[PDB]
From Swiss-Prot:
<feature type="binding site">
    <location>
        <position position="64"/>
    </location>
    <ligand>
        <name>O2</name>
    </ligand>
</feature>
<dbReference type="InterPro" id="IPR002335">
    <property type="entry name" value="Myoglobin"/>
</dbReference>
<keyword id="KW-0408">Iron</keyword>
<keyword id="KW-0963">Cytoplasm</keyword>
<dbReference type="InterPro" id="IPR009050">
    <property type="entry name" value="Globin-like_sf"/>
</dbReference>
<protein>
    <recommendedName>
        <fullName>Myoglobin</fullName>
        <ecNumber>1.7.-.-</ecNumber>
        <ecNumber>1.11.1.-</ecNumber>
    </recommendedName>
</protein>
<feature type="binding site">
    <location>
        <position position="64"/>
    </location>
    <ligand>
        <name>nitrite</name>
    </ligand>
</feature>
<feature type="domain" description="Globin">
    <location>
        <begin position="1"/>
        <end position="147"/>
    </location>
</feature>
<feature type="binding site" description="proximal binding residue">
    <location>
        <position position="93"/>
    </location>
    <ligand>
        <name>heme b</name>
    </ligand>
</feature>
<keyword id="KW-0561">Oxygen transport</keyword>
<feature type="modified residue" description="Phosphothreonine">
    <location>
        <position position="67"/>
    </location>
</feature>
<dbReference type="GO" id="GO:0098809">
    <property type="term" value="F:nitrite reductase activity"/>
</dbReference>
<keyword id="KW-0479">Metal-binding</keyword>
<dbReference type="Pfam" id="PF00042">
    <property type="entry name" value="Globin"/>
</dbReference>
<keyword id="KW-0514">Muscle protein</keyword>
<dbReference type="GO" id="GO:0016528">
    <property type="term" value="C:sarcoplasm"/>
</dbReference>
<keyword id="KW-0813">Transport</keyword>
């Protein structure tokens, strides 16, 4: 559970993310793929992408990152009351894409890194702590939904 103050900090930085969902998404994916090269293997149309510039140039990847962060943003806005938003996402990621919780930590780390890089003055210790607790909550609940669907990774 987050405090109301923690949610605010979460949603305050999120509003900043929303000034350029596309760019944030690209940075988060590029960081994810470079930090944890095994994650790229989940994406068939993203393996032809060999350099940081090809990634940035890929309209497919850019669109996808907007889809990711839109879905995560909508989750965050519910301040924990996110079962309806989280279920379809558990569903595809558990039974179709097969994304281990470990990979959700990796992208969570990339999110934190990109957030700090782009918004250091709106992402100090408290705001980092809060986004961290939010992503941890997202991860705990999605893991519980993975298990409900029969998926252990
Ligand atoms: C913040 C965490 C994440 C959010 C909110 C998220 C959200 C989404 C959404 C909304 C879609 C499109 C609909 C769907 O299939 O669910 C999607 C597709 C997908 N996601 Fe995730 N995702 C997240 C993490 C990941 C990670 C870490 C991987 C791989 C390491 C991944 C792999 C995929 C793949 C392979 C697809 C289908 C893309 C396609 O082939 O068209 N996702 N993601």
């Amino acid at each position: 559970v987050l405090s109301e103050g923690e949610w605010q900090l979460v949603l305050h930085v999120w509003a900043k993310v929303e000034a350029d969902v596309a760019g944030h998404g690209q940075d988060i994916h590029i960081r994810l793929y470079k930090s944890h090269p095994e994650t790229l293997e989940k994406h068939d149309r993203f393996k032809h992408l060999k350099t940081e510039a090809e990634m940035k140039a890929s309209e497919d990847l850019k669109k996808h990152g907007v889809t990711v962060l839109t879905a995560l943003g909508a989750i965050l806005k519910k301040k924990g009351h996110h079962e309806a938003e989280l279920k379809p996402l558990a569903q595809s990621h558990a039974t179709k894409h097969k994304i281990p919780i470990k990979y959700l930590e990796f992208i969570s780390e990339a999110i934190i890194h990109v957030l700090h890089s782009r918004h250091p003055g709106d992402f100090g210790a408290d705001a980092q702590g809060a986004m961290n607790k939010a992503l941890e909550l997202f991860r705990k609940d999605i893991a519980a939904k993975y298990k409900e669907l029969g998926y252990q990774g």
